[PDB]
Design an enzyme around this catalytic site. Structure first.
Site, short mmCIF file in Angstrom:
data_model
loop_
_atom_site.label_atom_id
_atom_site.label_comp_id
_atom_site.label_asym_id
_atom_site.label_seq_id
_atom_site.Cartn_x
_atom_site.Cartn_y
_atom_site.Cartn_z
CE1 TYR A 158 -3.78 4.69 9.56
CE2 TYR A 158 -3.02 2.61 9.30
CZ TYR A 158 -3.01 3.83 8.99
OH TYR A 158 -1.79 3.96 8.25
NE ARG A 209 6.85 -1.84 4.28
CZ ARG A 209 8.17 -2.27 4.81
NH1 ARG A 209 8.41 -3.41 4.70
NH2 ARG A 209 9.14 -1.15 4.72
CE1 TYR A 215 0.64 -5.01 4.65
CE2 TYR A 215 1.65 -4.55 2.39
CZ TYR A 215 1.39 -4.16 3.82
OH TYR A 215 2.04 -2.92 4.24
N1 LIG Z 1 -2.57 9.48 11.41
C1 LIG Z 1 -1.79 9.93 10.35
N2 LIG Z 1 -1.35 11.21 10.14
C2 LIG Z 1 -0.81 11.58 8.96
N3 LIG Z 1 -0.60 10.64 7.88
C3 LIG Z 1 -1.11 9.24 8.08
C4 LIG Z 1 -1.46 9.03 9.40
N4 LIG Z 1 -1.72 7.67 9.51
C5 LIG Z 1 -1.31 7.23 8.25
N5 LIG Z 1 -0.82 8.10 7.51
C6 LIG Z 1 -0.40 7.91 6.05
O1 LIG Z 1 -0.88 7.03 5.28
C7 LIG Z 1 0.39 6.20 5.23
C8 LIG Z 1 -0.13 4.43 5.50
S1 LIG Z 1 -1.13 3.96 4.36
C9 LIG Z 1 -2.72 3.93 5.67
C10 LIG Z 1 -3.34 5.10 5.41
C11 LIG Z 1 -4.81 4.76 5.84
N6 LIG Z 1 -5.74 3.90 5.26
C12 LIG Z 1 -5.65 6.28 5.97
O2 LIG Z 1 -7.00 6.32 5.85
O3 LIG Z 1 -4.79 7.27 5.67
C13 LIG Z 1 1.56 6.61 6.20
O4 LIG Z 1 2.63 6.46 5.67
C14 LIG Z 1 1.21 8.22 6.01
O5 LIG Z 1 1.76 8.60 4.81
#
Ligand SMILES: Nc1ncnc2c1ncn2[C@@H]1O[C@H](CSCC[C@H](N)C(=O)O)[C@@H](O)[C@H]1O
Ligand SMILES: Nc1ncnc2c1ncn2[C@@H]1O[C@H](CSCC[C@H](N)C(=O)O)[C@@H](O)[C@H]1O
Ligand SMILES: [Zn+2]
Lengths: 59, 262, 262, 55
Positions: free
Chosen positions: C92, C66, C70
């Site tokens: 996101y 990974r 990146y």
């Molecule tokens: N829709 C969602 N619902 C719950 N946890 C989420 C999620 N999307 C991402 N995550 C969490 O974030 C991790 C990826 S890291 C990315 C997170 C993103 N930047 C944020 O703003 O949250 C996942 O493994 C999970 O733990």
């Protein structure tokens, strides 16, 4: 005048990027006085306004 | 009548959700708790039917428990809901982060059979990560209310980014004051000294509320905190003080070691 | 050229800040990393010039670190900046919350003498508070990346709400697999057992990405975690094992007692 | 389909209208029965046919 500008600047990424390039120019063009511009450049939020706890830990 | 609590973020105008902004726009009535008069002008333009919750804070130096202030806010909100108004509560930042007014209103609203929900917003914590180019994931993250950290038993992890919110009233047990004393802050330092040395660099952070405003990112040794100038909006960031020790115990059960860590 | 990393939030279209949307709209080029194709579409209608970073992820049962994924992401983002293009990274949620790319791109940008900033977004954390109706300031909050908590030594405060992000790959050391195994998550249960009983109710949370979708809020005993269905977007919540107890030590220094709390 | 979701997610008037009557609002936007069925059964895959942290 002052409030209208801030509102726009906060929302409009175009204007924001315009302000970053030339703060004084952008401000002067939006009608800001010297005192107002001076306050902005010295970061005197107090004056600008002239011209937050919603919980606790007592269980 | 129904209830939707939203956040307007920290920055004026631009840091609210697109959806959250729409909610304000279409609301029958809006109950606001905003950082300043610029934020209060912007809101009023968005929707003129606004009641400012700020009024329910102690006025003219009166002794008033904040619990009572909050209760009154909650009740005012519900009064509108009960009356049959599509009601929106607009709080600065995230409406349900270190804010009890939204959770209490929603809770009470549901129990009275009204539709109530919370729309997430951008908080001071969200602003912090971005302003100091910190990813909470790097070494983890911890948050507590400063006074609760003092009044109750909390053990921090010194390897993580630690935050103490409402540091300005740290140790103010009455809940009738707007700020604390240097003596209180000194007790905090001595308490924190269980984990963090006195010369440990800490950060007084304040996210900007205006677009022409730069954030406060004041670095100082922990010992100097009591003398520092703090504001109701000040948050204290205590960066890690300790090296990560290998959980050799778990790696073994995983049948791996550091060298195998991708 | 310039860099601005923004966040789209978790919900389609509407959970992005007003300012952040305006940045996408006025960008010369946009690098995306969105949860699905519905938002990807929405993005493309905002600004047609988009390079989807998703392509740099391992494709075709390919073994790729990974990390190397990146690296290329950052590099591509930088290429546009070094070309003189007003560039934006649309990620996101919050662009810097458990997101390595953005921070790495802002750093590389500034170091090469370019203008780079991060605009905060609504994270998965922010969504959790509002969906579950939990205020992080109630009894405090802690967040760690599952694998990091299993690899290094982290001591949680069992009075707080504890989050473990990326629980689905908890223990996945190679950083090549898309998910972990049952035995990995079993060793996490035993690890957590130092602080939490086997029958302690935990919550598998998944914030909705679409407006017609309800969130995943699955409660289960800590013991049944290794048999649970976990997705890359799954966050683990572990409510307090203990209630707040008074800190008589400090109360004494403050010259007060519980009865004196407002 | 993708057009409806974008509107719904942005427009709070449409949102509240949907939450009053999901089916009526969806039918009024021309969603099919299998599309609506997919929404009510919360099947996001059928409707449709992230990790950036390490260490
Ligand atoms: N829709 C969602 N619902 C719950 N946890 C989420 C999620 N999307 C991402 N995550 C969490 O974030 C991790 C990826 S890291 C990315 C997170 C993103 N930047 C944020 O703003 O949250 C996942 O493994 C999970 O733990
Ligand atoms: N502009 C700002 N910068 C930094 N911290 C802030 C802040 N405004 C509020 N805070 C923090 O939040 C506390 C008030 S509680 C309100 C928090 C707000 N709902 C949010 O989502 O951030 C303050 O005591 C401080 O700890
Ligand atoms: Zn947090």
């Amino acid at each position: 005048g002052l409030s209208d500008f801030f509102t726009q600047l906060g929302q409009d990424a175009q204007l924001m990027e315009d302000y970053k390039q030339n703060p004084e120019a952008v401000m002067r063009a939006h009608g800001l006085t010297d005192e107002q511009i001076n306050a902005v450049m010295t970061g005197d939020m107090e004056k600008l306004k002239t011209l937050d706890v919603i919980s606790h830990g007592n269980g | 009548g129904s209830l939707v609590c939203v956040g307007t973020g920290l920055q004026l105008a631009g840091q609210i959700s697109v959806l959250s902004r729409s909610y304000i726009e279409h609301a029958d009535i809006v109950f606001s708790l905003l950082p300043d008069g610029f934020s209060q002008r912007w809101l009023t333009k968005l929707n003129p039917n606004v009641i400012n919750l700020q009024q329910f804070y102690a006025q003219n130096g009166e002794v008033k428990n904040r619990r009572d202030t909050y209760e009154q806010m909650v009740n005012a909100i519900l009064d509108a809901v009960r009356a049959g108004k599509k009601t929106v509560c607009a709080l600065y930042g995230h409406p349900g982060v270190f804010a009890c007014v939204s959770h209490m209103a929603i809770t009470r609203a549901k129990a009275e059979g009204f539709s109530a929900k919370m729309e997430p917003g951008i908080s001071a914590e969200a602003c912090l990560w971005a302003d100091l180019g910190i990813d909470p994931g790097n070494s983890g993250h911890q948050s507590f209310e400063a006074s609760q950290f003092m009044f109750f038993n909390h053990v921090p992890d010194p390897t993580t980014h630690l935050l103490l919110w409402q540091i300005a009233i740290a140790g103010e047990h009455t809940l009738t004051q707007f700020h604390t004393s240097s003596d209180r802050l000194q007790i905090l330092v001595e308490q924190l000294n269980q984990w963090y040395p006195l010369d440990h660099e800490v950060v007084i952070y304040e996210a900007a509320n205006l677009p022409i405003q730069a954030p406060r990112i004041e670095r100082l040794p922990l010992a100097n905190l009591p003398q520092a100038h703090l504001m109701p909006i000040s948050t204290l960031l205590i960066p890690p003080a300790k090296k990560l020790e290998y959980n050799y115990a778990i790696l073994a059960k995983l049948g791996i070691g550091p060298e195998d860590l991708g």
